[PDB]
């Protein structure tokens, strides 16, 4: 699976979104 | 190589203005041909590439998100 | 400011405070607006629209250009036709100026006012309508 | 593409002259010094000495084939996800 | 140095200065038709219809 | 203005053929730069516009039916 | 400024034809470089704009019905 | 800076007509190379920018209704 | 580097007009080749980049709303 | 969520609208 991989030529190397709940993503910047 | 130092010195002399085109003294007279700056720069570049004493050129770039 | 405690339900079971939203995941205290999907694109498209409108107004403003070595009042008097009795020019009629060798008259031409902006706007509007859920025709 | 379009559309014109910037904008653009804002009201015809020059910039097509490439990518994505292309795009 | 996108600007250039707006080729210069041909070939190979596959 | 007469005389001398480029007498020798006809004509016309002693230029024409 | 008067005098000398390019007397000899008319005119224009002693340039025109 | 004054004086000498290309006196003879007006103007402009004693350039304009 | 000061001095001499092309004294006579301004400026800039004593160049700009 | 974030390349860094009621936004410039 290339979903978790580096990418085609390594283009998605910096794309490492954090794994977090919906509250952790929403609440800090709700307002 | 000893050609590279001479080429660098010739380039510096040409830039500063100490390259001699014609020298004369009474009857004696000698005239030397002149070359363009770009050809000398290309000569120095290829000569330094051949020597390999440093590395100034690299491969093409790459992109990522 | 002050804060007040309002219980969700009265002791008898009556509903005192009402909160309606659709949860996405297991633990979600409060809901998220629908604009998060397309928030950035709408702002950037608004900026593009304003910039394009200003650019069109600017490019349409400058109609012509005068080149000469004389005084600016004299140059407009002899070429543009203004009256010195900078200097306003009357729009009545059609004029054919006479130019010396040093003088010149240039009528500026401008780029197409809407050069493909409509298609890009269409694409962005389709994206926004997909994000919001309304139809493209209704939105645009 | 959106950022590039905004950047290219932002620069409307260009002034070239050997004078001061304030003098150049006053004499060519029409700003008032009484950098320098210019009122958009009306149409203007500046006068230029030999040194001066006025250039109106021309930009590329705002959407030059981006839409069709987007269509192809959206068809690929809709095929991957299983929803119809019309529904997705 | 960041540049703010708000507004329209008309810079003033000395003789040595210059400003060039780059132009780019068409984003999809016939890639769609070539993809169409390759997708027809693939659909023929697999057995599903071209419309269903593509 | 006393420049206009000098410019007119210079133009007439250049046209007729009495404008001198170099003057030599034994050791002594002087050489003067030369200017084009169009530049002299433009100078003369612009100086006339400055003086304003006469009016040789008018505004654009108009049409009627 | 005292540069503007000198520039105006040099322009008049060049136009009339009294600019000296080369002067010689027996062994002695001196040669001066020459400049174009347009550059001198631009120099005078920018110099008189800097001084501001008069105003010869104005803003763009406007139209009305 | 002490270069800027020298550059300004050289520009004024070139414009007025006092820049010397060749000096000769009996046997002795010296000849100096010549430079363009635009190059000297660019040199003076960049030297003014480096010094920063004054401000002659500003940012792009802006429009409003 | 001691090759930057010499280049800067040569550029200043060329601008002011003190660069010598030919030198002659009775029988003796020497002539030096001449180089363009752009080549000297490029040489100076590239040698500055090699030295790294200062930073005069930066990366491309960025935009935000 | 990038709605409250800096943006794609940081373009929305200066976009910080205040959080206020409708009265606070409308009344100051009503006339």
Numbering used by the authors:
A (entry chain L), J (entry chain K): 24 to 54
B (entry chain P), F (entry chain X), G (entry chain M), H (entry chain N), I (entry chain O): 4 to 68
C (entry chain L): 217 to 301, 320 to 374
D (entry chain A): 268 to 301, 320 to 374
E (entry chain B): 321 to 374
What does the paper behind this entry write?
The temperate phage lambda, which infects the bacterium Escherichia coli, belongs to Siphoviridae. The virion of the lambda phage comprises an icosahedral head and a long flexible tail. The tail, which comprises the tail tube and tail tip, connects with the head through the neck. The neck–tail complex comprises a channel formed by stacked 12-fold and hexameric rings and a 3-fold symmetrical tip.
The adaptor ring, which is formed by 12 copies of gpW, is assembled below the portal. A total of 65 residues (4–68) of the 68-residue adaptor protein gpW were resolved. The structure of gpW comprises 3 domains: a β-hairpin (residues 23–36), a two-α-helix bundle (residues 4–22 and 37–54), and an extended C-arm (residues 55–68). The assembly of the adaptor relies on hydrophobic interactions among the subunits of gpW. The interactions of the adjacent gpW subunits are further reinforced by interactions between the adjacent β-hairpin domains, which form a β-barrel. Compared with the NMR structure of a gpW monomer in solution, the β-hairpin in our gpW structure undergoes a 90° rotation, from parallel to vertical with respect to the two-α-helix bundle domain, which facilitates the formation of the β-barrel structure. The assembly of the adaptor on the portal mainly relies on the electrostatic interactions between the electropositive adaptor top and the electronegative portal bottom. In addition, the C-arm, which is absent from the NMR structure, interacts with residues 320–324 of the portal wing through β-sheet augmentation.
